Amino acid sequence: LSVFGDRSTGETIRSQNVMAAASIANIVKSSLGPVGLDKMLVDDIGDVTITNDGATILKLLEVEHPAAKVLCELADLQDKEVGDGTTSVVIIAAELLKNADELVKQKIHPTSVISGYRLACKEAVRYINENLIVNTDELGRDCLINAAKTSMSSKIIGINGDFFANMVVDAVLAIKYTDIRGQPRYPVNSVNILKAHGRSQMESMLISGYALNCVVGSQGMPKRIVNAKIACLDFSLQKTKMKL
Amino acid sequence: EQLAIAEFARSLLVIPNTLAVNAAQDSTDLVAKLRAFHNEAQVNPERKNLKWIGLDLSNGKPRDNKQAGVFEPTIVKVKSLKFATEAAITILRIDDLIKL
Amino acid sequence: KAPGFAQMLKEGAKHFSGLEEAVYRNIQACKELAQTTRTAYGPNGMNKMVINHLEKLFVTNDAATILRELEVQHPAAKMIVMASHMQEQEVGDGTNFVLVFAGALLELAEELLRIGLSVSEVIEGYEIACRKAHEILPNLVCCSAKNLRDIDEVSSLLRTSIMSKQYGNEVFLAKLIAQACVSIFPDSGHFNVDNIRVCKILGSGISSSSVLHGMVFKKETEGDVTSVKDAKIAVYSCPFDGMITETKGTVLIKTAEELMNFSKGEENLMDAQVKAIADTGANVVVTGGKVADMALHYANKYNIMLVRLNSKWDLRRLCKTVGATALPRLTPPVLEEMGHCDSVYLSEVGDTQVVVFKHEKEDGAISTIVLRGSTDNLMDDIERAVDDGVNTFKVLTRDKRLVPGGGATEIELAKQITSYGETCPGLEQYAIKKFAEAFEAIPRALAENSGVKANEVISKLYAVHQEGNKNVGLDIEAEVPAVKDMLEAGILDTYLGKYWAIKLATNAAVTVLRVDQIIMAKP
Amino acid sequence: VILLKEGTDSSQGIPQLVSNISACQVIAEAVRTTLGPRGMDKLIVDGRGKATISNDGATILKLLDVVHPAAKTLVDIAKSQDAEVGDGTTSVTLLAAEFLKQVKPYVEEGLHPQIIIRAFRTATQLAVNKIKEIAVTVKKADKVEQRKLLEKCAMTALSSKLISQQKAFFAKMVVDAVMMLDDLLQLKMIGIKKVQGGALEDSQLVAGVAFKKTFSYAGFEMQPKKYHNPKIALLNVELELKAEKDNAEIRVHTVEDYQAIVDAEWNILYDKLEKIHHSGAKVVSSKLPIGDVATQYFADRDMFCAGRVPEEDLKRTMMACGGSIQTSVNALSADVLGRCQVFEETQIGGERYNFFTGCPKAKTCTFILRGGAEQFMEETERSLHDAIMIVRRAIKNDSVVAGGGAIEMELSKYLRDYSRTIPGKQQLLIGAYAKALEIIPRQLCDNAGFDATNILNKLRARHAQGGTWYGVDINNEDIADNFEAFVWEPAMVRINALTAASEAACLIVSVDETIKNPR
Amino acid sequence: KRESGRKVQSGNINAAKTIADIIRTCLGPKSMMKMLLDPMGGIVMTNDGNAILREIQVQHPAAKSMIEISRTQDEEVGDGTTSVIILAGEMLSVAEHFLEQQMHPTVVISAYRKALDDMISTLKKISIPVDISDSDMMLNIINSSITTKAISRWSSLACNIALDAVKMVQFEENGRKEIDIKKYARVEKIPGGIIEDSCVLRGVMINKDVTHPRMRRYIKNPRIVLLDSSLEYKKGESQTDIEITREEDFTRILQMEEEYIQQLCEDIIQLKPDVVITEKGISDLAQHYLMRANITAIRRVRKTDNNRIARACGARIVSRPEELREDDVGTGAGLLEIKKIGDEYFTFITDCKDPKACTILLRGASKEILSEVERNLQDAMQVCRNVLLDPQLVPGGGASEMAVAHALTEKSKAMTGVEQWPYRAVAQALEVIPRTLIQNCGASTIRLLTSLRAKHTQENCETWGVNGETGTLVDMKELGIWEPLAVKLQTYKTAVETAVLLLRIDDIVSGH
Ligand SMILES: Nc1ncnc2c1ncn2[C@@H]1O[C@H](COP(=O)(O)OP(=O)(O)OP(=O)(O)O)[C@@H](O)[C@H]1O
Ligand SMILES: Nc1ncnc2c1ncn2[C@@H]1O[C@H](COP(=O)(O)OP(=O)(O)OP(=O)(O)O)[C@@H](O)[C@H]1O
Ligand SMILES: Nc1ncnc2c1ncn2[C@@H]1O[C@H](COP(=O)(O)OP(=O)(O)OP(=O)(O)O)[C@@H](O)[C@H]1O
Ligand SMILES: Nc1ncnc2c1ncn2[C@@H]1O[C@H](COP(=O)(O)OP(=O)(O)OP(=O)(O)O)[C@@H](O)[C@H]1O
Numbered sequence A: 001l002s003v004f005g006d007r008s009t010g011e012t013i014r015s016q017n018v019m020a021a022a023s024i025a026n027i028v029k030s031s032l033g034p035v036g037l038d039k040m041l042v043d044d045i046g047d048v049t050i051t052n053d054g055a056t057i058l059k060l061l062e063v064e065h066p067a068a069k070v071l072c073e074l075a076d077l078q079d080k081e082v083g084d085g086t087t088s089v090v091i092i093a094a095e096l097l098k099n100a101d102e103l104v105k106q107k108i109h110p111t112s113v114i115s116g117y118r119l120a121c122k123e124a125v126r127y128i129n130e131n132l133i134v135n136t137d138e139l140g141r142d143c144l145i146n147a148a149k150t151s152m153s154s155k156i157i158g159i160n161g162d163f164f165a166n167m168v169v170d171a172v173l174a175i176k177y178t179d180i181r182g183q184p185r186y187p188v189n190s191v192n193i194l195k196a197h198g199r200s201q202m203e204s205m206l207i208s209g210y211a212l213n214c215v216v217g218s219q220g221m222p223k224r225i226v227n228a229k230i231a232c233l234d235f236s237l238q239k240t241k242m243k244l
Numbered sequence B: 001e002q003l004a005i006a007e008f009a010r011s012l013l014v015i016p017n018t019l020a021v022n023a024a025q026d027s028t029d030l031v032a033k034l035r036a037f038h039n040e041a042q043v044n045p046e047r048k049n050l051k052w053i054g055l056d057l058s059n060g061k062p063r064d065n066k067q068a069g070v071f072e073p074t075i076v077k078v079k080s081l082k083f084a085t086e087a088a089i090t091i092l093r094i095d096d097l098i099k100l
Numbered sequence C: 001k002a003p004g005f006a007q008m009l010k011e012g013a014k015h016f017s018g019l020e021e022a023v024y025r026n027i028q029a030c031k032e033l034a035q036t037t038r039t040a041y042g043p044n045g046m047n048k049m050v051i052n053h054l055e056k057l058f059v060t061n062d063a064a065t066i067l068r069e070l071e072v073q074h075p076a077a078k079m080i081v082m083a084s085h086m087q088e089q090e091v092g093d094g095t096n097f098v099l100v101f102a103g104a105l106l107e108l109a110e111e112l113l114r115i116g117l118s119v120s121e122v123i124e125g126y127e128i129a130c131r132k133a134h135e136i137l138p139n140l141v142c143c144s145a146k147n148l149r150d151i152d153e154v155s156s157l158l159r160t161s162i163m164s165k166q167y168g169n170e171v172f173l174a175k176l177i178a179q180a181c182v183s184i185f186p187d188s189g190h191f192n193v194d195n196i197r198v199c200k201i202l203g204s205g206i207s208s209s210s211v212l213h214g215m216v217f218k219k220e221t222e223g224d225v226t227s228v229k230d231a232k233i234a235v236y237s238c239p240f241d242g243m244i245t246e247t248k249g250t251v252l253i254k255t256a257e258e259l260m261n262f263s264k265g266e267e268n269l270m271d272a273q274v275k276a277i278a279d280t281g282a283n284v285v286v287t288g289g290k291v292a293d294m295a296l297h298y299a300n301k302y303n304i305m306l307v308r309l310n311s312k313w314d315l316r317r318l319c320k321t322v323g324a325t326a327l328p329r330l331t332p333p334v335l336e337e338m339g340h341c342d343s344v345y346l347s348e349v350g351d352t353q354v355v356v357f358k359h360e361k362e363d364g365a366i367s368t369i370v371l372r373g374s375t376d377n378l379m380d381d382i383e384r385a386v387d388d389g390v391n392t393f394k395v396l397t398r399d400k401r402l403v404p405g406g407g408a409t410e411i412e413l414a415k416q417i418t419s420y421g422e423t424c425p426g427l428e429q430y431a432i433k434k435f436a437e438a439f440e441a442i443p444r445a446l447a448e449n450s451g452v453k454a455n456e457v458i459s460k461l462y463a464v465h466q467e468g469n470k471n472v473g474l475d476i477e478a479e480v481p482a483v484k485d486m487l488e489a490g491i492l493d494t495y496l497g498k499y500w501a502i503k504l505a506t507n508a509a510v511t512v513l514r515v516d517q518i519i520m521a522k523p
Numbered sequence D: 001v002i003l004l005k006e007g008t009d010s011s012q013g014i015p016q017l018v019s020n021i022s023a024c025q026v027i028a029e030a031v032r033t034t035l036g037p038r039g040m041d042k043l044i045v046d047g048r049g050k051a052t053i054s055n056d057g058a059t060i061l062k063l064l065d066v067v068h069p070a071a072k073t074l075v076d077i078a079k080s081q082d083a084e085v086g087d088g089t090t091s092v093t094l095l096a097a098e099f100l101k102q103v104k105p106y107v108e109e110g111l112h113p114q115i116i117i118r119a120f121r122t123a124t125q126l127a128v129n130k131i132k133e134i135a136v137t138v139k140k141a142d143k144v145e146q147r148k149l150l151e152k153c154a155m156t157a158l159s160s161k162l163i164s165q166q167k168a169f170f171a172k173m174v175v176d177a178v179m180m181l182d183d184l185l186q187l188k189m190i191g192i193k194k195v196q197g198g199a200l201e202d203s204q205l206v207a208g209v210a211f212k213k214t215f216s217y218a219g220f221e222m223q224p225k226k227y228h229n230p231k232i233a234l235l236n237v238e239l240e241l242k243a244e245k246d247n248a249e250i251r252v253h254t255v256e257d258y259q260a261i262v263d264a265e266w267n268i269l270y271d272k273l274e275k276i277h278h279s280g281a282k283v284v285s286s287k288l289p290i291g292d293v294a295t296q297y298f299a300d301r302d303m304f305c306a307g308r309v310p311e312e313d314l315k316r317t318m319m320a321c322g323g324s325i326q327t328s329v330n331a332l333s334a335d336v337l338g339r340c341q342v343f344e345e346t347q348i349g350g351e352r353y354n355f356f357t358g359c360p361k362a363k364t365c366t367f368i369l370r371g372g373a374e375q376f377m378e379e380t381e382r383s384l385h386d387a388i389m390i391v392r393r394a395i396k397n398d399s400v401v402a403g404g405g406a407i408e409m410e411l412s413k414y415l416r417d418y419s420r421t422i423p424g425k426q427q428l429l430i431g432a433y434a435k436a437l438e439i440i441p442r443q444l445c446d447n448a449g450f451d452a453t454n455i456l457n458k459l460r461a462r463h464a465q466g467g468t469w470y471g472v473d474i475n476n477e478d479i480a481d482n483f484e485a486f487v488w489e490p491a492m493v494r495i496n497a498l499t500a501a502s503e504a505a506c507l508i509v510s511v512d513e514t515i516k517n518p519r
Numbered sequence E: 001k002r003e004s005g006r007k008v009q010s011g012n013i014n015a016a017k018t019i020a021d022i023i024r025t026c027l028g029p030k031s032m033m034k035m036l037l038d039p040m041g042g043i044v045m046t047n048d049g050n051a052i053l054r055e056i057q058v059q060h061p062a063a064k065s066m067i068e069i070s071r072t073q074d075e076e077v078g079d080g081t082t083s084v085i086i087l088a089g090e091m092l093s094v095a096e097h098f099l100e101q102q103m104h105p106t107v108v109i110s111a112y113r114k115a116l117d118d119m120i121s122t123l124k125k126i127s128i129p130v131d132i133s134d135s136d137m138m139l140n141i142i143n144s145s146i147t148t149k150a151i152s153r154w155s156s157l158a159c160n161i162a163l164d165a166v167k168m169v170q171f172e173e174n175g176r177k178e179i180d181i182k183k184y185a186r187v188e189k190i191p192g193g194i195i196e197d198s199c200v201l202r203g204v205m206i207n208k209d210v211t212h213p214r215m216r217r218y219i220k221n222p223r224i225v226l227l228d229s230s231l232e233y234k235k236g237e238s239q240t241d242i243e244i245t246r247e248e249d250f251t252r253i254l255q256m257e258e259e260y261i262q263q264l265c266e267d268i269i270q271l272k273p274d275v276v277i278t279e280k281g282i283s284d285l286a287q288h289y290l291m292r293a294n295i296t297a298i299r300r301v302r303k304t305d306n307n308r309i310a311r312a313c314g315a316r317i318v319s320r321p322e323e324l325r326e327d328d329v330g331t332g333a334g335l336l337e338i339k340k341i342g343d344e345y346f347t348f349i350t351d352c353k354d355p356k357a358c359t360i361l362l363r364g365a366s367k368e369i370l371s372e373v374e375r376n377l378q379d380a381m382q383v384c385r386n387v388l389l390d391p392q393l394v395p396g397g398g399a400s401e402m403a404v405a406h407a408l409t410e411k412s413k414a415m416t417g418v419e420q421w422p423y424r425a426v427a428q429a430l431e432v433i434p435r436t437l438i439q440n441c442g443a444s445t446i447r448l449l450t451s452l453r454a455k456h457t458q459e460n461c462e463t464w465g466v467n468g469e470t471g472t473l474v475d476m477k478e479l480g481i482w483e484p485l486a487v488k489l490q491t492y493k494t495a496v497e498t499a500v501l502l503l504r505i506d507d508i509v510s511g512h
Helices: A012-027 A054-060 A068-079 A086-105 A112-131 A145-154 A161-172 B003-011 B014-022 B027-039 B074-092 C021-038 C063-068 C078-088 C094-112 C119-139 C151-157 C258-280 C295-301 C312-319 C376-399 C408-423 C429-437 C441-448 C456-466 C495-514 D013-031 D057-061 D073-082 D089-102 D106-107 D113-135 D147-156 D167-178 D257-279 D291-300 D309-319 D374-396 D405-421 D426-436 D437-447 D454-463 D493-511 E007-022 E051-055 E062-076 E081-091 E096-100 E105-123 E136-144 E150-169 E247-271 E303-313 E367-390 E400-411 E420-429 E432-442 E445-458 E485-502
Strands: A007-009 A037-040 A050-051 B054-055 B061-062 B096-098 C048-053 C059-061 C196-202 C210-213 C216-217 C233-236 C284-287 C305-308 C343-348 C353-360 C367-373 C400-406 C472-474 C483-485 C493-494 D042-045 D051-054 D190-196 D205-206 D231-235 D283-287 D304-306 D343-346 D351-355 D365-371 D399-404 D470-472 D477-482 D488-490 D511-516 E184-190 E224-227 E275-278 E296-298 E358-362 E394-395 E482-484 E507-510
Touching: A007 A012, A012 A054, A012 A068, A012 A086, A012 B074, A012 E507, A037 A054, A037 E062, A050 A054, A050 C343, A050 E062, A054 A086, A068 A086, A068 B074, A068 C284, A068 D511, A086 A112, A086 B003, A086 B014, A086 B074, A086 C400, A112 B074, A145 A161, B003 C400, B003 D454, B003 E394, B014 B027, B014 B054, B027 B054, B027 D426, B054 E400, B096 E136, C021 C063, C021 C094, C021 C495, C048 C063, C048 E485, C059 C376, C063 C094, C078 C094, C078 C495, C094 C119, C094 C441, C119 C408, C119 C429, C119 C495, C151 D283, C196 C216, C196 C376, C210 C353, C216 C367, C233 C312, C258 C295, C284 D231, C284 D488, C284 E358, C295 C305, C367 C376, C376 C493, C376 C495, C400 C408, C400 C495, C408 C429, C408 C441, C408 C456, C408 E445, C441 C456, C441 C472, C441 D106, C456 C472, C456 C483, C456 E420, C456 E485, C472 D089, C493 C495, D013 D057, D013 D089, D013 D106, D013 D493, D013 D511, D051 D057, D057 D073, D057 D089, D073 D089, D073 D493, D089 D106, D089 D426, D089 D493, D106 D113, D113 D399, D113 D405, D113 D426, D113 D493, D147 D167, D147 D374, D167 D205, D167 D365, D167 D374, D167 E400, D190 D374, D231 D257, D231 D309, D257 D291, D291 D304, D309 D351, D343 D437, D374 D488, D399 D405, D399 D493, D405 D426, D405 D437, D405 D454, D405 D470, D426 E096, D437 D454, D437 D470, D454 D470, D454 D477, E007 E062, E007 E081, E007 E096, E007 E507, E051 E081, E062 E081, E062 E485, E081 E420, E081 E432, E096 E105, E096 E420, E105 E400, E105 E420, E105 E485, E136 E150, E136 E367, E150 E184, E150 E358, E150 E367, E224 E247, E224 E303, E358 E367, E367 E482, E394 E400, E394 E485, E400 E420, E400 E432, E400 E445, E432 E445, E482 E485
Parallel strands: A037 E507, C048 D511, C196 C367, C233 C284, C284 C305, D190 D365, D231 D283, D283 D304, E184 E358, E224 E275, E275 E296
Antiparallel strands: A007 B096, A037 A050, B054 B061, C048 C059, C210 C367, C216 C353, C343 C353, C400 C493, C472 C483, D042 D051, D205 D365, D343 D351, D399 D488, D470 D477, E394 E482
């Protein structure tokens, strides 16, 4: 035969596709979780970037192989859908291919594997949705205060965990606003965290309002006002110019 | 299709398997402690069965996620199982290689 | 040619230079010997696939069987094997204790030589820490034996020797040895290991075994004599057959009339040889070879008890018991080569006829443990457990002192030695600190064989010993990495067995580290 | 130049166990396809050049003789299987290597082998108690006689065979053959002989000992066959006139002794014939052939003689008559003579056959086969030997379990459910122990040529609904209740096969280093 | 291609151990020299650890990360870069707890970061306050770097240069006491003169020469003006180019060039200035209308140097030349001077106060002597900066290393868990700093280090250090081998921050 390349078929292209796909899972195996290990991303110039986030790992990982190129596009379908989850798809799907590769050696055609996987996936959503929890228990019942206390344990703030967890629980419930038909979500903007020297870390106060880090200057003008009108302007009341 | 779904259940066990090896614990004990508590929720509906048992990677001991407050959204869990099986379907449908 | 061989000037022997680290090759020689027996320590240890030189297969985990079959050729590693045979003397335990602790001694000594310490200074710190280890060992003695010579005291203390020799027989082998040593225990200072002889019959299993007094052979009595109290025992290794002279003795047969004359003449000479034992008063004849059918008729004619023993190892046991010497000639009527026994009789145990050799006017110290088994490979492993079980209690005729085991006397010895090494000034504090870390490898070898991470067990043992909770050892569980109390579980080893084990393993580190060059010499 | 090994073959660690696990599978591959009644046979030739055709697992492993150390550990388990129960060497050889196959990826990930030892001792101890609970005692169930039940199990075992059409006749003969024996049942007592020619309906069952009788010498028209109480003599002496062993050659030069020389050579034959006449032996059986002159001797003395008897049939005659085999003739007396009630020379199959009936120690039988080929009768002999084996184990052991992988798929379901309730390292090992027990219904589908995945997926679905005695069928290409179809096996052989396969798998796992002595 | 598993955990260890073994013997005053072989046959025998690794190319990604973390540490403080790479190579050198014990690195990082908190707590216990007001105590700190140099003949005057420079940059009103030597203390080199001629002036110096005598020579009240726009031909919003090849194009361009510049120069001379400072360049025709008013032309100044001029006089930064006003005045400045120094002209806008900026003027007999003082004073300025940042010293010369390693041994007796075994390895890895000091002196290392630990146990831990001159142990309270605290604080912090970065790497993959 005289063709324009090399041809290869059979089960040897099945074993080569799962070994190229599971090798990408080993790139995102140790980086899974909050205690995930850093991995070096060697560039073609010579510099290296130390990243441990698995979303930035697969973006910079360049493997010139079509089996590994399939797993590159699912990172683009993950952030555009929800925004999180990315490497948990990779370790699941590569172990799905490795167990199915053992089925090919056990005289099973992959057509029963494909139709069996779609019924196993739809029944997985059915068992999940029968064991859910509605978004509630915001006040009075803790799975929250204790929820944010685990994230706060890695720093020096975790010595007094009950004092600082109350500052973030009431701040999350304060920024709630529906604004479309009863959605309620939470905005990307949040509370402004300022700092001062109050002789210890126990003098933090939960102020129910925005705090500006500016000084008014003169003292003869009174600092306590009752009127409601607030003026904001960007043009300078100083000596103006046409252009810089 | 019994072996297709039975290997689908064992392939989902790599998520506590990689989490146990990153928590510096014995992966044969920490994953098996998760399935020992989740099996009792299906055998009998008595309240002595531990339900919604999460994985505390800090102390190396399984705890309840309702008390610890470890929660995840449903759309990150549903779309992960939806996208991973469709990606495993496309690679499994490859039976011939052509290069030019 | 140029350049010449540096420092190799004696019979072409490979003399490594200072950069080639000639003293480090002896450390790697004892490292490979210790690694074959590191995973074999403990009840969770692995078996060894033994292929003997006579092409016989064996599956066993004894420490003495590994050293005898794996023919070591390195003489630097032969210093520990010659020390392990010294461990076989005066005590029957600690053969793995010599190979592991001295192997961990030289492995930790290689880290000291990499800093630049001299070999003459490190070896002086080991003999200092050995004398300090001999002071805390009486202080680590928790309890002692009761010395009441009963079954319950012997069987409760024998559970340490049955551990790691034959697992699963902890309830059976603790009672079989206990019924044998209590017959010699009234004889104070006369308990000997060669008094307890082991015999093995192919049978069902371990639970069908029993204990008998005196010398018991598995072969039945060939004659019809059931019981006779004759003292004269004449052992003959020759088979009972026709007489062949030491002279020429040409017997000619031509026709069938000469066939019936010489066959009857051989039966008459066989009658004369049995009559040559009857006139001297010996009614006990043990035959080493085969017995003819006509010789069985002459046995019941003169009422002489004839037994046949084909094996040479059981025939040599009667030579050192009654004093009877096996004669190779066709029954020489002599009296000096005979034995002495009060009563010999035939009896059955488990539907198997055995011959008993006991003494009634003498006090009696001979005991025989009839062992039963389906496979001859596993039956030989229980046979070596008897020799390492009796020698565990052969040392208890001395001062009865017991130490706790399972790393209880290992971490507590490593704690007090480091306290002596921290306060000691001078450069000798480095060798004493590595003498204590060599004591940690033996609970590390016990935890790694049980499928448990070794660093988790060591930190759990150092947490309870810092609070003063003594006698805490390893809990034998692959799933539970915790610890348990050794006085409540019943693991108590010997103080004298731990005394010679640390002494011989330290001197093995003395002898190997003094050798830094190997030279072949021709006589 | 100073070495520690110097030719010593020794290695330890993890890959010494992986080299011992994969070396165990080469012995299982030698007897993988021989499982089942429709299994493939193996061709083994010895050093002399003789080809042996057999599918029995006990005969394959006895002629393999692999010099590997781990391969020798599967030999003595097959030897102990013959002493413990009697057969099942090909079942414990296949089951031992599949235990090591499922734990082979678990050893390479860093798990210690001693934890797998603690899991094999646990799940096998649960498998002993699980068998005795499901095992039902069928002795007088539904008020049916045991003779009718013994013909039902032999009908399924002889199905899909050459005699599958006439299996109603062959099922009634295998039951009465074991019923003719005493309480001490033995497969060696019932012998099978083959007679060439005729249809399958002419097969007969001899209550005593019958042999081939290849004696084709002279001796017709005399020596009457019917005897009331004959004295059965078992000899090994040649009674020919010019024999290869009994002769007399004297070299004299006188014509007077030349008559005496031929007379002395005849007196060797005549005195050996006169001692049988004094002992009163009516029938003369000898291993060596008997000449035409000695047949004329017993013709006038009212006796029978028949030589060329095999020594295997002579020992079966000794166990039937109760006498003893005597080689010489001067020791022939009534202590070694036998006795029977009916002896006759039959003409079944065109050839002459001798058989005794009515012995005082008649504990042996003989099965006569008829057919158009000897290889038709060779496979019929092994199938009827299999039909006797199922009947014999039903009489000895009443507590039976369902065969055909029904007890293997039920043990795979219980041990999987026990593993889900156990935390720790015992979950992934006992759960792999349950999947390793599924090789018996899987290799039964492979050797029968069926779809191995289409039956096993429907077999586990039948056990999930509540089917406790459903297995594979050798006739139909679907699942069936083996308890209703009378496919049985005793509970004691199923228990002893599990404790032997777990002990053979534990001896390989507990070995980590191989010691070899240079000699 | 790619590599993962435990091989990269051992591969990054030998990559950092190879860098640490090169400059291990270059520690102390007896630092051994190192010979570098060039492809052109050149040889440099510099013993400076920053100069050795700069001229050595590396190919390992872990070894490349080892050099840049010390290079950034050299930009922060000017001392202690060799001790970082030695300590970062010794902490990873005990691979028995990393590979043989089969320990995950997360146990090691939890033991290393917990040992980092004991580094800061121990150094504050062995510290000593500094009387910074006394000039005699400041001389005993900077003298450790002035020895064996050509500046050592003028140590009494060179110490006054660095001490007066750091105090003017440091602002006590801000509270945090910031010192930045690169901007507010820009050092310039002037040829000619001697070492004694070099002094410190309170202003900013301009190195632009004088090209015409029609300038301001001595002005008591300097009227300064700052401008950002250019002084050239008017360009459009496009990217067109200017090419003058025709005589018709030469007349039309130059007439537009003169009319726009004269319109620009009329707005600056109406305020009667003394010196003009433009951000961009000044053309040749722009000086023709500027020389008629006798104004000093200063051009080509950066935006960063422009704010130092505005804070010196108090002028206003004006964006366009048409928008000048009367508030752009430099009233309050001392004197304007264009006086030549060694046949080079320099502009002086100095004052008699502290206008948040300064400069350093160096003089010398030859240009090689100019490069010798500026590399010694900049090394001396960063050391004296750390003293005024926090007046606390530590006993150097290996005394602080044995005091820290003694506190970790008694702390490890109460630290239970699996992590106590790598916790004791940091105490033996911190002993490599007094270990190489005895090996460079030539004495027996283990004979002296064992008696060094015996003196740190029974006696006081603040004394009994190592002298790197004679080879024996001396008391650190008797000799001035005192190190700053902020240097030793960032040394142990970076050595942990290097060990937390190399041990956390578990995969090396490629990709652009
Ligand atoms: N609070 C928590 N407690 C225990 N485990 C957690 C917690 N939060 C997340 N995890 C585990 O960590 C894993 C997330 O890993 P990581 O954040 O490194 O990458 P990822 O988010 O899965 O990648 P991607 O962004 O594509 O989805 C999840 O599988 C989850 O099981
Ligand atoms: N089950 C157990 N519990 C506690 N300690 C044990 C156990 N098994 C073994 N050991 C420890 O192992 C050491 C002796 O073990 P082992 O029985 O392997 O030596 P040994 O085999 O008797 O020596 P030899 O080879 O001379 O017979 C002792 O220190 C003992 O404390
Ligand atoms: N008539 C039958 N129908 C269906 N299955 C059967 C039948 N007879 C035997 N089997 C199955 O075949 C398996 C054994 O096959 P085979 O007869 O080849 O080995 P075996 O000779 O019984 O082995 P062993 O001699 O060790 O007992 C058993 O597990 C049994 O369940
Ligand atoms: N005579 C001496 N004996 C022993 N140690 C000394 C002596 N003189 C100085 N030292 C110490 O040696 C240290 C210098 O060591 P080293 O050369 O490794 O660092 P360095 O190169 O000065 O650091 P950097 O590269 O940051 O300048 C000084 O901090 C000082 O405390």
